[PDB]
Design a protein around this ligand. Structure first.
Ligand code: 09G
Ligand code: ZN
Length: 394
């Protein structure tokens, strides 16, 4: 899998993308890797934040499906025309695939200035594809038309006039042992829509938040490469920030720091890492009553920004933020770990990433098992709307 190592790039906080080609002759585009969605969609007209876009009419292998699509996120949305075309990943498997593509014709708060990506590769399950689940997602087509094992793995690697470049690896069809150290621990996928998981416990510097564990997963917990922060439900975020504030309390930062809206700075090289606590999320294990923990450092949740006007200083953004749609284990989490999306066995694996940023006293850690007897149920059941209830699935 050496040809797939280091095949992701991006700018810190603005998404990891992989190079893809669509069409005949091949049009090259930089495509966000997003495990929180299941559509393959590409900028298909001019836009202030796009260097280039997909030109359907210039591909002899394009086919229009004569159907529109609309996807609204919490932040951002887009619409497009559905079609299929030939797609390859030059630093991926040695295959070409006919896949669904949404040509994005309009959008708002979707594309990001300076990010260098022009589309999105949705790697989650058909259940949340748009307009509905009969639009085969890309990975499904890849596995179906080729010999590629139904699994991929992501190593996202952390970081004055530009933001920091980041690099990473997306290994399509397996697991590269150079990319992690020590044990690889798996947590069941609760349901194949998002990559949904269940957190059974949260510790800040070894101290239990002591919340009803249903609160950790209200209204869901998902692993999303296409989300920058660790995002936490309102009540969880408030307790977690209270604990981190407490530990770090020799430094009094402005409100805007903790809201994720302001940098704080120390003189080059003098950041007091050791006043910030480690955060451990315990995930449901494969075995009943077992769990394992993934522990991240302040090096992951304190995200570095080089300020033009204080470029002498090491400056950081707080990259834990509030959610009203559940826990999102985003890049902040993932940059600790080599994360294995084992679709075949309906599980997600975590191991310590051979590229995670640490210091001489503490590392990100993946550790288990831990055991509870009569371990309760920590899952939440999303209220079912009449809209969702009325849909037939033939
Ligand atoms: N109908 C629907 C529907 C609603 C919500 C979701 C949630 O989608 C995510 O979380 C993806 C998309 C993401 C980050 N990851 C985002 O939220 N804004 C944004 C902006 C730019 C790039 C990636 C993203 C998925 C579906 Br499908
Ligand atoms: Zn029907």
């Amino acid at each position: 899998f050496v040809e797939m190592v280091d095949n992701l790039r991006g700018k810190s906080g603005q998404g990891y993308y992989v190079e893809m080609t669509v069409g005949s002759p091949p049009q090259t585009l930089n495509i966000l890797v997003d495990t929180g969605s299941s559509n393959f969609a590409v900028g298909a007209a001019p836009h202030p934040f796009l260097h280039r876009y997909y030109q359907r009419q210039l591909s002899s292998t394009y086919r229009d499906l004569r159907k529109g699509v609309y996807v609204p996120y919490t932040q951002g949305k887009w619409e497009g025309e559905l079609g299929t075309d030939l797609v390859s990943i030059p630093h991926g498997p040695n295959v070409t695939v006919r896949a669904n593509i949404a040509a994005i014709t309009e959008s708002d708060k979707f594309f990001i200035n300076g990010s260098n990506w022009e589309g999105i590769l949705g790697l989650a399950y058909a259940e949340i594809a748009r307009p509905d689940d009969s639009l085969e997602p890309f990975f499904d087509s890849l596995v179906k038309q080729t010999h590629v094992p139904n699994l991929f793995s992501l190593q996202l690697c952390g970081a004055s006039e530009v933001l920091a470049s980041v690099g990473g690896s997306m290994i399509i069809g397996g697991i590269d042992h150079s990319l992690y150290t020590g044990s690889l621990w798996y947590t069941p996928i609760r349901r194949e829509w998002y990559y949904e998981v269940i957190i059974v416990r949260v510790e800040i510097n070894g101290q239990d938040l002591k919340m009803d564990c249903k609160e950790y997963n209200y209204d869901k917990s998902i692993v999303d490469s296409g989300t920058t922060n660790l995002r936490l439900p309102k009540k969880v975020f408030e307790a977690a920030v209270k604990s981190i504030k407490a530990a770090s309390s020799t430094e009094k930062f402005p409100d805007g720091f903790w809201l994720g809206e302001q940098l704080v700075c120390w003189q080059a090289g003098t950041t007091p890492w050791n006043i910030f606590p480690v955060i451990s999320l315990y995930l449901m294990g494969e075995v009943t009553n077992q769990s394992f923990r993934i522990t991240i450092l302040p090096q992951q949740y304190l995200r570095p920004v080089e300020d033009v006007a204080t470029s002498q200083d090491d400056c950081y953004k707080f990259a834990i933020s509030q959610s009203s749609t559940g826990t999102v284990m985003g890049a902040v989490i993932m940059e600790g770990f080599y994360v294995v999306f084992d679709r075949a066995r309906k599980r997600i694996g975590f191991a310590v990433s051979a590229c995670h940023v640490h210091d001489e006293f503490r590392t990100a850690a993946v550790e288990g098992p831990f055991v509870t007897l009569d371990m309760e149920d920590c899952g939440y059941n999303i209220p079912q709307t009449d809209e969702s209830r009325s849909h037939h699935h033939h």
